[PDB]
Design a protein around this ligand. Sequence first.
Ligand SMILES: C=CCO[C@]1(C(=O)O)C[C@@H](O)[C@@H](O)[C@@H]([C@H](O)CO[C@]2(C(=O)O)C=CC[C@@H]([C@H](O)CO)O2)O1
Ligand SMILES: [Mg+2]
Ligand SMILES: [Mg+2]
Ligand SMILES: [Zn+2]
Ligand SMILES: [Zn+2]
Lengths: 216, 214
Amino acid sequence: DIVMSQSPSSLAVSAGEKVTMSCKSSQSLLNSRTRKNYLAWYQQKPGQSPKLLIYWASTRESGVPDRFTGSGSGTDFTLTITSVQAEDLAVYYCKQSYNLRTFGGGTKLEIKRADAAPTVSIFPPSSEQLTSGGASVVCFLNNFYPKDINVKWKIDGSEGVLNSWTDQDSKDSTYSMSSTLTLTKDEYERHNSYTCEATHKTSTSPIVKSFNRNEC
Amino acid sequence: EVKLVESGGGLVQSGGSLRLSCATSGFTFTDYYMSWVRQPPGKALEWLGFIRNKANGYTTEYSPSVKGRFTISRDNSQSILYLQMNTLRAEDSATYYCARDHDGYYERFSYWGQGTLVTVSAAKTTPPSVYPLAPSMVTLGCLVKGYFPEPVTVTWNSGSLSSGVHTFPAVLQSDLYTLSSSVTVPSSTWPSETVTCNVAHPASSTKVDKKIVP
Ligand SMILES: C=CCO[C@]1(C(=O)O)C[C@@H](O)[C@@H](O)[C@@H]([C@H](O)CO[C@]2(C(=O)O)C=CC[C@@H]([C@H](O)CO)O2)O1
Ligand SMILES: [Mg+2]
Ligand SMILES: [Mg+2]
Ligand SMILES: [Zn+2]
Ligand SMILES: [Zn+2]
């Protein structure tokens, strides 16, 4: 059959640097009839559809930046991005169309940027949820880098939690993360202080945000 | 302007069937092969099959992963592409894209639709509960809690607030999804001006506006 393989699985590059990525096919994609390689590259930005960048191995689609260049022949192909931009954050796929079509497994390009501390916000449960017997406390850890981060919840001073990180931001190359603590109303009502504490490598001091139920 | 727009995805039980459509415009439909490609959440693109152009008899081909079980057809009067899916299984859960394919000259998929999400599950449809997240700059949110299946859409001020917005990917917990969205605006602008999250959950036809009130 025709097996398409890509490398690396993922890598991160700083804005302005060069990105190199590879695509292999189990058999030659060089069509003897037209003497072209039936190999195309697609870019898929977070939560977007794939978009054509390059086809016939090296032909850059109109509207696609000069910084994207496809190369290689036969079984081996390379996508090169010079002077990478923040907006270039995406999974990049190669695809043969020599015999039906087959996509490679993709290469995830992340953007390296300077370390940035998160902005932390805590939100008490809404009365419209409380009416119903539940109490979700939410903390946003917004616009930080790098991705690793620790969140602790403290209720009246001591430590049902859902965490979610966003994809990397296509503009400032930051990540954000939400932490949601869900309690019953009966349990929420037993305690006064609710605290989320974010520890990130940007500071040895956790960022602490809190509210007290008596102050609501 | 070339347009492709898939519809028809949502929740279906194991063993059931489902038919997707892809409305096209802006190009000579019959000149073109058309393909379907799917993508399970967080995974790679998978080519599924194509239907050829007029010059080639509108014949069909399929990946072995789906041959015998999926069927591609086309309406040449209305420029609509179809995918018939039968005997669906868990692994068929995915975003389905239609893409414009070969014209006899170029080797490329030039255009792709926005995608339609198919979920294969025995779980019931459950609409979301939508809760406000209120406390130089101020960060507000909406919590979109306890829904199934994916997806939901979240906008802010019917889309006029687009900068300083992010939506946190949904997390599945005990058979339901929850997600949240943040919006950051100048504190001189809220609560003095209105901030509202607009939430839709197509599977239950849920439409919600939630004003963030101080
Ligand atoms: C129009 C015929 C073939 O086009 C396809 C196809 O299977 O429909 C689709 C194309 O994307 C491409 O994969 C070609 C494949 O390259 C075979 O096409 C040629 C060839 O390149 O040798 C071209 C012309 C005639 C054809 C066969 O010799 C007879 O149909 O081969 O396949
Ligand atoms: Mg307790
Ligand atoms: Mg056959
Ligand atoms: Zn207590
Ligand atoms: Zn055939």
